[PDB]
Amino acid sequence: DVSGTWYLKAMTVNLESVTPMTLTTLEGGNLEAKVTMSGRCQEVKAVLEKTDEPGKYTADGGKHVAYIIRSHVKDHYIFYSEGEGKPVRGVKLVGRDPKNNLEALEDFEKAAGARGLSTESILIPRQS
Protein backbone atom coordinates (compact mmCIF):
# COMPACT_ATOMS: atom_id res chain seq x y z
CA ASP A 1 0.00 0.00 0.00
CA VAL A 2 1.06 3.63 -0.23
CA SER A 3 0.79 4.39 3.45
CA GLY A 4 4.11 4.83 5.32
CA THR A 5 7.01 7.29 5.67
CA TRP A 6 8.61 8.13 2.31
CA TYR A 7 12.13 9.50 1.83
CA LEU A 8 12.96 11.56 -1.27
CA LYS A 9 15.60 9.92 -3.54
CA ALA A 10 15.49 12.17 -6.66
CA MET A 11 13.35 14.99 -8.06
CA THR A 12 13.11 16.98 -11.27
CA VAL A 13 13.95 20.72 -11.00
CA ASN A 14 12.73 24.01 -1.80
CA LEU A 15 9.37 23.48 -0.06
CA GLU A 16 8.94 20.85 -2.79
CA SER A 17 12.06 19.04 -1.52
CA VAL A 18 11.03 18.57 2.17
CA THR A 19 11.67 14.94 3.22
CA PRO A 20 10.48 12.64 4.59
CA MET A 21 6.64 12.81 4.05
CA THR A 22 4.30 10.43 5.89
CA LEU A 23 1.08 9.26 4.14
CA THR A 24 -1.83 7.88 6.26
CA THR A 25 -4.99 6.34 4.78
CA LEU A 26 -8.13 7.96 6.00
CA GLU A 27 -11.56 6.44 6.13
CA GLY A 28 -13.08 6.71 2.68
CA GLY A 29 -9.78 6.30 0.80
CA ASN A 30 -8.42 9.86 1.06
CA LEU A 31 -4.78 10.24 2.31
CA GLU A 32 -3.27 12.64 4.86
CA ALA A 33 0.22 13.86 3.81
CA LYS A 34 2.34 15.19 6.72
CA VAL A 35 5.89 16.70 6.98
CA THR A 36 7.85 18.47 9.71
CA MET A 37 9.29 21.90 8.94
CA SER A 38 10.53 31.29 10.29
CA GLY A 39 9.80 30.21 13.88
CA ARG A 40 9.07 26.90 15.60
CA CYS A 41 9.52 23.30 14.47
CA GLN A 42 6.09 22.20 13.27
CA GLU A 43 4.12 19.37 11.66
CA VAL A 44 2.21 20.45 8.52
CA LYS A 45 -0.69 18.27 7.23
CA ALA A 46 -2.77 18.23 4.02
CA VAL A 47 -5.51 15.97 2.59
CA LEU A 48 -5.11 14.34 -0.84
CA GLU A 49 -8.64 13.57 -2.05
CA LYS A 50 -9.16 10.27 -3.85
CA THR A 51 -10.69 10.58 -7.37
CA ASP A 52 -12.51 8.00 -9.46
CA GLU A 53 -9.29 7.28 -11.39
CA PRO A 54 -6.79 4.72 -9.96
CA GLY A 55 -3.68 6.39 -8.46
CA LYS A 56 -4.90 9.97 -9.03
CA TYR A 57 -5.55 12.36 -6.12
CA THR A 58 -6.23 16.13 -5.88
CA ALA A 59 -5.13 18.74 -3.37
CA ASP A 60 -5.18 22.43 -2.58
CA GLY A 61 -8.80 22.85 -3.67
CA GLY A 62 -8.28 21.00 -6.98
CA LYS A 63 -5.41 23.16 -8.18
CA HIS A 64 -2.91 20.39 -7.43
CA VAL A 65 -3.15 16.84 -8.95
CA ALA A 66 -0.84 14.05 -7.77
CA TYR A 67 -0.39 10.65 -9.48
CA ILE A 68 1.13 7.68 -7.62
CA ILE A 69 3.07 5.53 -10.15
CA ARG A 70 4.43 2.06 -9.44
CA SER A 71 8.17 1.33 -9.56
CA HIS A 72 9.68 -2.11 -10.44
CA VAL A 73 11.77 -1.77 -7.29
CA LYS A 74 10.15 -2.97 -4.03
CA ASP A 75 9.27 -0.24 -1.46
CA HIS A 76 9.74 2.67 -3.94
CA TYR A 77 7.13 4.74 -5.74
CA ILE A 78 7.18 7.55 -8.24
CA PHE A 79 5.00 10.62 -7.60
CA TYR A 80 4.12 12.88 -10.58
CA SER A 81 2.38 16.19 -9.77
CA GLU A 82 0.91 19.09 -11.73
CA GLY A 83 0.28 22.40 -9.89
CA GLU A 84 0.36 26.19 -10.10
CA GLY A 85 1.62 31.73 -10.05
CA LYS A 86 2.67 29.80 -13.15
CA PRO A 87 1.91 26.13 -13.95
CA VAL A 88 4.53 23.73 -12.63
CA ARG A 89 4.97 19.96 -12.80
CA GLY A 90 7.61 17.43 -11.71
CA VAL A 91 8.43 13.78 -10.90
CA LYS A 92 9.78 12.53 -7.52
CA LEU A 93 11.28 9.11 -6.75
CA VAL A 94 10.61 8.00 -3.15
CA GLY A 95 11.36 5.03 -0.91
CA ARG A 96 10.86 3.61 2.58
CA ASP A 97 14.56 3.37 3.56
CA PRO A 98 16.15 6.43 5.20
CA LYS A 99 19.38 5.79 3.29
CA ASN A 100 19.51 6.90 -0.35
CA ASN A 101 20.81 3.86 -2.29
CA LEU A 102 20.00 5.33 -5.77
CA GLU A 103 19.09 1.88 -7.09
CA ALA A 104 15.69 2.83 -8.56
CA LEU A 105 16.87 5.69 -10.87
CA GLU A 106 16.04 3.92 -14.18
CA ASP A 107 12.31 4.14 -13.40
CA PHE A 108 12.63 7.80 -12.36
CA GLU A 109 14.34 8.51 -15.70
CA LYS A 110 11.68 6.63 -17.72
CA ALA A 111 8.78 8.34 -15.90
CA ALA A 112 10.30 11.77 -16.57
CA GLY A 113 11.00 11.06 -20.27
CA ALA A 114 7.46 9.70 -20.73
CA ARG A 115 6.19 13.05 -19.57
CA GLY A 116 8.38 15.48 -21.51
CA LEU A 117 10.79 16.19 -18.54
CA SER A 118 13.89 14.44 -19.96
CA THR A 119 16.02 17.58 -20.03
CA GLU A 120 15.17 19.07 -16.57
CA SER A 121 17.94 19.08 -13.88
CA ILE A 122 17.75 16.49 -11.06
CA LEU A 123 18.10 17.16 -7.34
CA ILE A 124 19.42 14.26 -5.21
CA PRO A 125 19.14 14.57 -1.36
CA ARG A 126 21.86 12.93 0.73
CA GLN A 127 20.22 13.73 4.12
CA SER A 128 16.78 14.53 5.58
Ligand SMILES: [Cl-]
Ligand atom coordinates in the same frame (compact mmCIF):
# COMPACT_ATOMS: atom_id res chain seq x y z
CL1 LIG B 1 16.86 3.81 -1.54
Ligand SMILES: [Cl-]
Ligand atom coordinates in the same frame (compact mmCIF):
# COMPACT_ATOMS: atom_id res chain seq x y z
CL1 LIG C 1 16.53 5.05 -5.08
Ligand SMILES: [Zn+2]
Ligand atom coordinates in the same frame (compact mmCIF):
# COMPACT_ATOMS: atom_id res chain seq x y z
ZN1 LIG D 1 -7.67 12.34 -14.95
Ligand SMILES: [Zn+2]
Ligand atom coordinates in the same frame (compact mmCIF):
# COMPACT_ATOMS: atom_id res chain seq x y z
ZN1 LIG E 1 16.21 3.39 -3.66
Ligand SMILES: [Zn+2]
Ligand atom coordinates in the same frame (compact mmCIF):
# COMPACT_ATOMS: atom_id res chain seq x y z
ZN1 LIG F 1 11.98 -0.39 -14.21
